[PDB]
Design a protein around this nucleic acid. Structure first.
Ligand SMILES: [Zn+2]
Ligand SMILES: [Zn+2]
Length: 102
DNA sequence: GGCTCAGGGCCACAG
DNA sequence: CTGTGGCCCTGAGCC
Protein backbone atom coordinates (compact mmCIF):
# COMPACT_ATOMS: atom_id res chain seq x y z
CA UNK A 1 0.00 0.00 0.00
CA UNK A 2 3.06 2.21 0.11
CA UNK A 3 4.88 3.65 -2.87
CA UNK A 4 8.56 4.38 -3.34
CA UNK A 5 9.52 8.02 -2.60
CA UNK A 6 11.54 7.97 -5.83
CA UNK A 7 10.19 5.85 -8.69
CA UNK A 8 6.74 5.59 -7.11
CA UNK A 9 6.35 1.81 -7.40
CA UNK A 10 4.71 -0.47 -4.86
CA UNK A 11 7.21 -1.20 -2.11
CA UNK A 12 8.34 -4.76 -1.51
CA UNK A 13 9.67 -3.76 1.89
CA UNK A 14 12.58 -2.13 3.68
CA UNK A 15 15.49 -1.78 1.28
CA UNK A 16 18.51 0.50 1.73
CA UNK A 17 16.82 2.33 4.61
CA UNK A 18 13.51 2.98 2.86
CA UNK A 19 10.27 1.38 1.78
CA UNK A 20 11.26 0.60 -1.78
CA UNK A 21 10.49 -1.85 -4.57
CA UNK A 22 12.71 -4.37 -6.34
CA UNK A 23 12.95 -1.81 -9.14
CA UNK A 24 14.73 0.60 -6.79
CA UNK A 25 16.78 -2.20 -5.26
CA UNK A 26 17.77 -3.69 -8.61
CA UNK A 27 18.46 -0.40 -10.40
CA UNK A 28 20.32 1.02 -7.41
CA UNK A 29 22.70 -1.95 -7.43
CA UNK A 30 23.03 -1.85 -11.21
CA UNK A 31 24.08 1.77 -10.94
CA UNK A 32 26.30 1.80 -7.85
CA UNK A 33 27.90 -1.66 -8.18
CA UNK A 34 28.82 -1.24 -11.84
CA UNK A 35 30.15 2.23 -10.97
CA UNK A 36 27.65 3.89 -13.27
CA UNK A 37 27.52 7.66 -13.39
CA UNK A 38 25.10 9.80 -15.36
CA UNK A 39 24.30 13.47 -15.84
CA UNK A 40 21.14 15.35 -16.75
CA UNK A 41 21.53 18.18 -19.26
CA UNK A 42 19.11 20.46 -17.46
CA UNK A 43 17.30 20.21 -14.12
CA UNK A 44 19.42 17.68 -12.21
CA UNK A 45 16.27 17.08 -10.21
CA UNK A 46 13.52 16.49 -12.76
CA UNK A 47 10.04 15.24 -11.93
CA UNK A 48 10.62 11.62 -11.02
CA UNK A 49 7.42 10.05 -12.29
CA UNK A 50 6.53 6.64 -13.70
CA UNK A 51 7.52 7.67 -17.21
CA UNK A 52 10.19 10.29 -16.54
CA UNK A 53 12.07 7.94 -14.19
CA UNK A 54 13.20 6.15 -17.35
CA UNK A 55 14.51 9.16 -19.26
CA UNK A 56 16.70 10.53 -16.47
CA UNK A 57 18.81 7.82 -14.76
CA UNK A 58 20.90 10.49 -13.03
CA UNK A 59 17.82 12.22 -11.64
CA UNK A 60 16.52 8.85 -10.45
CA UNK A 61 19.88 8.12 -8.81
CA UNK A 62 19.90 11.54 -7.14
CA UNK A 63 16.31 10.91 -6.11
CA UNK A 64 17.35 7.67 -4.39
CA UNK A 65 20.14 9.28 -2.36
CA UNK A 66 17.96 12.32 -1.65
CA UNK A 67 14.95 10.35 -0.37
CA UNK A 68 17.27 8.54 2.02
CA UNK A 69 18.52 5.40 0.28
CA UNK A 70 21.83 4.36 1.79
CA UNK A 71 24.63 4.22 -0.76
CA UNK A 72 26.77 2.36 1.77
CA UNK A 73 24.17 -0.41 1.67
CA UNK A 74 25.35 -1.34 -1.80
CA UNK A 75 27.55 -4.37 -1.29
CA UNK A 76 29.18 -4.12 -4.72
CA UNK A 77 31.53 -6.78 -3.38
CA UNK A 78 29.25 -9.86 -3.59
CA UNK A 79 28.47 -10.77 0.03
CA UNK A 80 24.67 -11.05 0.21
CA UNK A 81 24.88 -10.06 3.86
CA UNK A 82 24.68 -6.37 3.07
CA UNK A 83 23.68 -5.52 6.62
CA UNK A 84 26.05 -2.78 7.72
CA UNK A 85 26.26 -0.76 10.96
CA UNK A 86 22.87 0.78 10.16
CA UNK A 87 21.22 -2.66 10.12
CA UNK A 88 19.28 -2.00 13.40
CA UNK A 89 17.53 1.01 11.81
CA UNK A 90 15.41 -1.28 9.63
CA UNK A 91 13.56 -3.01 12.45
CA UNK A 92 13.75 0.11 14.60
CA UNK A 93 12.11 2.37 12.03
CA UNK A 94 9.64 -0.38 11.17
CA UNK A 95 8.63 -0.80 14.82
CA UNK A 96 8.18 2.96 15.24
CA UNK A 97 6.55 3.54 11.85
CA UNK A 98 4.02 0.74 12.26
CA UNK A 99 3.98 0.13 16.02
CA UNK A 100 0.98 -2.11 15.42
CA UNK A 101 0.38 -4.66 18.16
CA UNK A 102 -0.14 -8.40 18.05
C1' DG B 1 20.47 -21.92 18.53
C1' DG B 2 16.96 -20.66 16.05
C1' DC B 3 13.37 -17.43 13.28
C1' DT B 4 13.53 -12.82 11.27
C1' DC B 5 14.68 -9.38 8.26
C1' DA B 6 17.02 -7.37 4.61
C1' DG B 7 20.42 -7.41 0.75
C1' DG B 8 22.99 -9.41 -3.53
C1' DG B 9 22.63 -12.55 -7.33
C1' DC B 10 20.83 -14.06 -11.36
C1' DC B 11 16.21 -14.26 -13.99
C1' DA B 12 12.68 -13.62 -16.69
C1' DC B 13 10.06 -10.80 -19.03
C1' DA B 14 9.39 -5.83 -21.14
C1' DG B 15 11.50 -1.79 -24.02
C1' DC C 1 20.15 -7.15 -27.46
C1' DT C 2 19.43 -4.10 -23.55
C1' DG C 3 17.20 -3.06 -19.64
C1' DT C 4 13.51 -2.50 -16.11
C1' DG C 5 11.73 -4.65 -12.45
C1' DG C 6 11.65 -9.24 -9.76
C1' DC C 7 11.91 -13.58 -7.51
C1' DC C 8 15.29 -16.44 -4.99
C1' DC C 9 19.11 -17.64 -1.92
C1' DT C 10 22.22 -16.42 1.07
C1' DG C 11 23.61 -13.81 4.73
C1' DA C 12 23.68 -10.11 8.74
C1' DG C 13 20.69 -9.50 12.62
C1' DC C 14 18.21 -9.99 16.28
C1' DC C 15 15.18 -12.80 19.43
ZN1 LIG D 1 10.67 1.81 -6.23
ZN1 LIG E 1 16.69 14.78 -15.70
Amino acid sequence: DELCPVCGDKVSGYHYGLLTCESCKGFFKRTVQNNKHYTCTESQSCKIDKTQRKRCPFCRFQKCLTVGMRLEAVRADRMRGGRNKFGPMYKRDRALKQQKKA
